[PDB]
Ligand binder design. Sequence first.
Ligand SMILES: C=C(C)[C@]12C[C@@H](C)[C@@]34O[C@](Cc5ccccc5)(O[C@@H]1[C@@H]3C=C(COC(=O)Cc1ccc(O)c(OC)c1)C[C@]1(O)C(=O)C(C)=C[C@@H]41)O2
Ligand SMILES: C=C(C)[C@]12C[C@@H](C)[C@@]34O[C@](Cc5ccccc5)(O[C@@H]1[C@@H]3C=C(COC(=O)Cc1ccc(O)c(OC)c1)C[C@]1(O)C(=O)C(C)=C[C@@H]41)O2
Ligand SMILES: C=C(C)[C@]12C[C@@H](C)[C@@]34O[C@](Cc5ccccc5)(O[C@@H]1[C@@H]3C=C(COC(=O)Cc1ccc(O)c(OC)c1)C[C@]1(O)C(=O)C(C)=C[C@@H]41)O2
Ligand SMILES: C=C(C)[C@]12C[C@@H](C)[C@@]34O[C@](Cc5ccccc5)(O[C@@H]1[C@@H]3C=C(COC(=O)Cc1ccc(O)c(OC)c1)C[C@]1(O)C(=O)C(C)=C[C@@H]41)O2
Ligand code: NA
Ligand code: NA
Ligand code: NA
Lengths: 431, 431, 431, 431
Amino acid sequence: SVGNTVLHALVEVADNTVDNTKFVTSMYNEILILGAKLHPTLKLEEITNRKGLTPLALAASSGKIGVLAYILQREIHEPECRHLSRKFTEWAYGPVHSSLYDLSCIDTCEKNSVLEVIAYSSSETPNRHDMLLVEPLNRLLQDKWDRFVKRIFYFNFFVYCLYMIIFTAAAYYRPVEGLPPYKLKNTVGDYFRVTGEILSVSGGVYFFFRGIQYFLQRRPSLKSLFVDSYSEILFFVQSLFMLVSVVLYFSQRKEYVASMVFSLAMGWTNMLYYTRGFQQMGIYAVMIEKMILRDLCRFMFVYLVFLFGFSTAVVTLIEDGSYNSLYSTCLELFKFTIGMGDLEFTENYDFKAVFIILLLAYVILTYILLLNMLIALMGETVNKIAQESKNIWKLQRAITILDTEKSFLKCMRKAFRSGKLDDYRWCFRVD
Amino acid sequence: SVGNTVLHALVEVADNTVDNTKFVTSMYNEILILGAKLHPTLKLEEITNRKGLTPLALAASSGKIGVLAYILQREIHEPECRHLSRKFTEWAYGPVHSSLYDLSCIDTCEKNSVLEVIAYSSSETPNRHDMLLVEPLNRLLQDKWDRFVKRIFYFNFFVYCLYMIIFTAAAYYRPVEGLPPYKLKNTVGDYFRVTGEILSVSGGVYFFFRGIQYFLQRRPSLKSLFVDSYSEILFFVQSLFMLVSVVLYFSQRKEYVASMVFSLAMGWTNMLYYTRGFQQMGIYAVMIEKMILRDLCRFMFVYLVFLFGFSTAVVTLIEDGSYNSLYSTCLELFKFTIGMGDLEFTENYDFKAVFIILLLAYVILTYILLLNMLIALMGETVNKIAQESKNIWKLQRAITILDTEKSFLKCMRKAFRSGKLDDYRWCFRVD
Amino acid sequence: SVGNTVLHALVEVADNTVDNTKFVTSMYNEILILGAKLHPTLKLEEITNRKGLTPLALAASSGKIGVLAYILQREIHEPECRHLSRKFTEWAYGPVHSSLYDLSCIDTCEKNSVLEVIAYSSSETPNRHDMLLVEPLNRLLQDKWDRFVKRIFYFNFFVYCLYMIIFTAAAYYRPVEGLPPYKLKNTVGDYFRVTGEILSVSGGVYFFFRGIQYFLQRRPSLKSLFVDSYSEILFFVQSLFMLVSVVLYFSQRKEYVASMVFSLAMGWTNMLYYTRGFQQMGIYAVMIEKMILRDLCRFMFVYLVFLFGFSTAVVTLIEDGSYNSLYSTCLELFKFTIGMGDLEFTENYDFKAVFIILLLAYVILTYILLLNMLIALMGETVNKIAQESKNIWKLQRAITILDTEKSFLKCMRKAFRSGKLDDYRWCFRVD
Amino acid sequence: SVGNTVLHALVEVADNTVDNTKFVTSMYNEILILGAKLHPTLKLEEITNRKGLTPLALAASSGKIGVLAYILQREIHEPECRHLSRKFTEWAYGPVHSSLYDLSCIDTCEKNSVLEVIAYSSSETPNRHDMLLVEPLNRLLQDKWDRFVKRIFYFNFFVYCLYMIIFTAAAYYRPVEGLPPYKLKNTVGDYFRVTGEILSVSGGVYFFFRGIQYFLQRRPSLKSLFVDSYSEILFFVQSLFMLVSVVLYFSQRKEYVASMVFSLAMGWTNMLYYTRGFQQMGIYAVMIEKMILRDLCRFMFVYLVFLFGFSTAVVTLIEDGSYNSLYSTCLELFKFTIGMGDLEFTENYDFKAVFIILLLAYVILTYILLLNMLIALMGETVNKIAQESKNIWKLQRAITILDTEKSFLKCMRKAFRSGKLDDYRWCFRVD
Ligand SMILES: C=C(C)[C@]12C[C@@H](C)[C@@]34O[C@](Cc5ccccc5)(O[C@@H]1[C@@H]3C=C(COC(=O)Cc1ccc(O)c(OC)c1)C[C@]1(O)C(=O)C(C)=C[C@@H]41)O2
Ligand SMILES: C=C(C)[C@]12C[C@@H](C)[C@@]34O[C@](Cc5ccccc5)(O[C@@H]1[C@@H]3C=C(COC(=O)Cc1ccc(O)c(OC)c1)C[C@]1(O)C(=O)C(C)=C[C@@H]41)O2
Ligand SMILES: C=C(C)[C@]12C[C@@H](C)[C@@]34O[C@](Cc5ccccc5)(O[C@@H]1[C@@H]3C=C(COC(=O)Cc1ccc(O)c(OC)c1)C[C@]1(O)C(=O)C(C)=C[C@@H]41)O2
Ligand SMILES: C=C(C)[C@]12C[C@@H](C)[C@@]34O[C@](Cc5ccccc5)(O[C@@H]1[C@@H]3C=C(COC(=O)Cc1ccc(O)c(OC)c1)C[C@]1(O)C(=O)C(C)=C[C@@H]41)O2
Ligand code: NA
Ligand code: NA
Ligand code: NA
């Protein structure tokens, strides 16, 4: 009905349990063998459904770990069936076994490769996180990293550091005259300043168009828009602030500074994107992302409810006879959170006992709030957050490898390890 | 002796263990079959005890989850006994099993339904918390939520937000002249102000009478008054502050403001009641409630003992030669807890070493106390607090559904799924 | 060699493991039966060693919980041996079994009873903590609590509250003239003041002599002096401060205030002693004690090493050209711990970069210290600290019951449950 | 190929698992027996590879705890093979077994002893950490500690305390005249000052040469430089600061103070080195070392990225119309971390909303950072950090014993327990 065959149904049946995995594996193997015996001329696994996914691509995209692990490491040691295998063993010693894997459909299917569907999954799949631990995929990604992607990624991080340093210098040394745009001066420092500004705007345009390219190629669902693509959204919003700053700058508004500094701040925090992909340092940025997306909404809602309620109570209580505004009272109550609450910031009230009782209740409740946030987050420290962060680190490495391979910047796409070692299957030697 | 029958004794025997659950289940099944064979004209499970509870209602109210799960999903596949079943399976596929459950006695018994006794239990029962996860009850509550209760609850939350915004505006813009009540002025701003005040008092009266209705219909035991009914108590106390404010306002006392701001503060914090029912955000309000009721007493007693002891020591030590009162010293020592302790807030003493030693001991002991509070709370985070909070979220969802169904605001009570599909058992189709 | 018999050796063999406990139980039963058959006229278990301990008292004092549990609940249902049993079951129903336990040697041996050795042991024994959960002992202690000790303990806590309130009032309203003792005034307030002072000194003398009595009766080893007897030490030191205050007061030194306030502070914190014995509120009172005795020494040593090192570095760096003392610099660096560190508290230096680097290093290191303290304490929260706190709560209840029974304040010692129900064995009915 | 024999390769087989440990045990026993039967005159285990390691030294250095445990406790009870054993039982009681272990190759091999290779390994080995718990090694190290090393270590700690007190006094009382060196005055205070300075520089020279000696003896790889030899690196850097201070002092620079205070601060914090060796107190210093080396880098990178980004945004936003420098803004934003952030530290801007939004975002993000650091560190508290800290404590105790034995300060190296009890195997009695 959906253009698929029995193998896609087999992929759908599996639920990453031992018995169902073995059942699906047995059916998959027997069906492949019988299909080869019935139709030796047909490629059984190359039929794509209406979504353009092969059974291997469907297993990769659907989060079916057992099926993917079986298929990628499938090996056959009987006549009339060796042509259906993907793994081939070259040497068999005690501790080490050297074997050739098939890179076909893993690096490219011309629509949807295995690494692409794994990396660019919706993140709502059951356990895609561990799919990169499968031997051929793990070693392929590590080889791609150590070969050429590592240097390219470090170069991109260095270039981003230069871009941010130039942006910081250009923004720091912005002229303080009124009503932009500003006329240049013959002093060399001003030529360096405008060169830095031009480079900053160029980088902003680059990130803007890269963000548009990402959103058009990925087409986020608008429900998982922030769950995935978080770093891309932050880079795009930083570029949006940069371009709004350019518009305000040429529109003769000093409010361009209001945009620019936000972009500047975002730009520096966007260096955490490059931190992700490091085994030790990337975990921290991953945890920041997950806390902001997942655990910050409820805390900020409850905290702002308490802050607004008690600030409205306090500002109602105080009357002039300084701080008479709701904003000032909100700031004074927020100061308690940062350990700078005066607790006698005004005397412009009647019923001092009421004012002090309100502030003490706010303090006690706010510390209860912070304590409950801590407790709620520490309830998830039993192997959950650590495993999730290591998994996201692996996924970021995979995504970086895929993006760098997509760019290649050399008009040359060849990045295979062993080559076509007839069975031209793009072998991959693993020792 | 208490008007009950053997089935209620069977309910009492069970203790939510596998062996006793199976034993009680076997006895219940055999008793029902034999009773139907002996008295085919009698409804065996409809006999109520002195408390008006059927054996199903007793199992639900008593926290006997195994017996409840057996009864609600009871199915019979033999002649002469099909009329004793509640579950009826109509289709049996691999992944799909479509069945009709019996809603009789779950939505209403005319005195005590299953959902009512589960939701309004004393909370001291063994395992009521997971009773809402039993398939017919979970599906029924989710159906009621998604059907009509979700919109009504969101509307009530929106109306409460409007009420609180109006109250905040009316209280913020209160006149600052002396000796209320204040004469209405012809300016439109004062017409809006008095309209907002009238609406605020109307909402206060509404919450006051709803609190009275809740306490009269529930009749809390005065020992679990705060363990359950916490949100209702907070709403009622907020309304009490509002009405005391009205009395003081018309009694020509400025002290009405002292009441009003507390109500205002409480009103905003009472928005957390609407937060409960959200799977992610409601856990925070649940944790706040549990910490205030359970853990705050211990910490507040120990902290106040240390604060009062050291403040009495300090105020005794200092002598005039500002802060000479016990209240001022208590505030100055409290300031250490919020990171604003001066540690040299006065020089009006002899024995500077004694004063500084007292303050340092207070600081060290207070941080020891806060550390031990953290430790004691973190000792309870091993899958306990999180599970309790998820359970309370489910219970609040059920309570919201029951209250909304009780109101109905349409002079129409019927909210059944499948209707009378002869055996008119108010079927509920689950797929 | 040590005056003991076979039963004491059997007690020593046990190590609170299932197999060794069963072995010791079998040997104890068989040797008791054989001894009764060989010497029917002798009481086998009444022989005491050189320490005055019976085998039951040795098992209780040595922390051999399995042997104690077997002996206290020993029951015999065969002829020629019933006289060797302690438990006597009178009724055996399904949910309830009504039995008589032997209180002989549990309430008194005239030297060392079971409850006395359990409560007043060094606390270094293996599992004295769970010995109070043994059915006869748990029910006996709960019965003693609910019968008469509960009211006496609450009365003592109330009297201590009155004593501390009187002390706080007398010390707060101390005269501010120089050179005590102070001549009285005919105003009634001064008569109340001197009456309060006399009552405060009387309470101090009472606690002084009670502390002496405790230390003479227990004779602490001076190595477990603080691990046990912590509350008694705090009460004794509070009384010592009171008596030193009396001496300084009559010695014409204002330094009596230096003593008095410490006593006052200690007195208020000593209310936590009465908090212990409550299942919930007592936990903090337990945990604080442990943190002071166990976890505070190492943290304070490391923290003071860092504080003193960086304070010496800073005070060396700064030079006059206010804070030039080591004490002032130590206070200014301590202020960082309480969130009140200025970070520019002086400009009296050369090399501002060095000063700021030192302060930033101190801040980062101190927050690492606090973080590592938290981490180390949280590493022991996996059922260890909480269980110890519950156990110490039970032990404090037992100690309170024993002390109250020792006092009795009625010239009447009998507090047995069932009496001499021939075999007059001071029965205790458990249902 | 590497100068080894079969025993070394067999030792390399083990991976500290039960099955491979048993396999290696059986093969090692059979190889030794057959070699003795084939070559009775040869010492089978004395053959060293190109690294100078015996199979025992290889098992110890390679972190093969099971093989080491078997070899060190090897015992033989058959003829023609007793000469191959190391453990010899002298008495066999029920709870006590008194046996003689062979100290040969444990105290010295003349190149690489067992204790030396265990203590001075790279720390990257699988399970060297628990090798010190092997009965002969644990008892030997405890015997060396209690015999003579405990007093020597406490003497060294006392001498270091005197050195640091003298250094603190000499640096505190440094003259405040310009342009060192300072001329000695005839007043006795300056004689004490110059004596203290000479002693401080002498201690610095001592630690400098001891650091060089250590680095020459170990030759760290420069990649594991800080993970092991952290304490020696800190002592060496303290001495480097001392000697740079000496050079600047005689170079007529006041900047010597800039060096001296660092060597003062480090010196006091280097007392934590002596804290290691206490069971309870040393864990804190171990945790500080691990926190600094492992976790501080990533947290400080992310924190400094946020601080620098928002400081650049804020300093760009503010314009003169005080704090106009990036350094001042960085300090003002750092103040939020220590609870002293003003949140209105300047008004020299336009767009107050932008400034306040930036500061609030920085505050919220920084507290998210601290919360995530806490969470990440608490995720590793499930028996991981505590066990590693206890292990490193045991390692430091062993290192202290080895260094003290290396010094001996008595021109006498003999420290064996039982001596040559014929078979002169340097027996060690364990009971
Ligand atoms: C798009 C979103 C969701 C976002 C954009 C801005 C407004 C952001 O605040 C938030 C909301 C916020 C505001 C204030 C405090 C905390 C969170 O979170 C990010 C967003 C969140 C941060 C903090 O997190 C990071 O950017 C670090 C980071 C971690 C992992 C990544 O993969 C990453 O990719 C670039 C970046 C930085 C800001 O962009 C920033 O510099 C300022 C001034 C505000 C931060 O909104
Ligand atoms: C009736 C009780 C028990 C209660 C009423 C008042 C006085 C309360 O303080 C307490 C005690 C207290 C006082 C100061 C600090 C902490 C706790 O807790 C609640 C009560 C507790 C809070 C904080 O908790 C909440 O109301 C949020 C909430 C969570 C879950 C809910 O189901 C809920 O239902 C409305 C509300 C808000 C206050 O009502 C408030 O706004 C002020 C000024 C004080 C709080 O007393
Ligand atoms: C005898 C000891 C060991 C002790 C006596 C004094 C000096 C003490 O500080 C300590 C050390 C100290 C000093 C400063 C901060 C923390 C700890 O701990 C107790 C001692 C510890 C405390 C804090 O702990 C408690 O007394 C609460 C408590 C808990 C459990 C109990 O069984 C108990 O019995 C009375 C008391 C209170 C003080 O006595 C006090 O009021 C002042 C001014 C200092 C405290 O020394
Ligand atoms: C060589 C390193 C790695 C080191 C040397 C200096 C600069 C150090 O800061 C660090 C980095 C640093 C800076 C500021 C805050 C935290 C960490 O960590 C240590 C180093 C770390 C510390 C804190 O840790 C300790 O020395 C305690 C300690 C624990 C365990 C040990 O075995 C130990 O051996 C001596 C010392 C103290 C300093 O030496 C010090 O006194 C000052 C002023 C800075 C600390 O650099
Ligand atoms: Na904290
Ligand atoms: Na924790
Ligand atoms: Na603070």
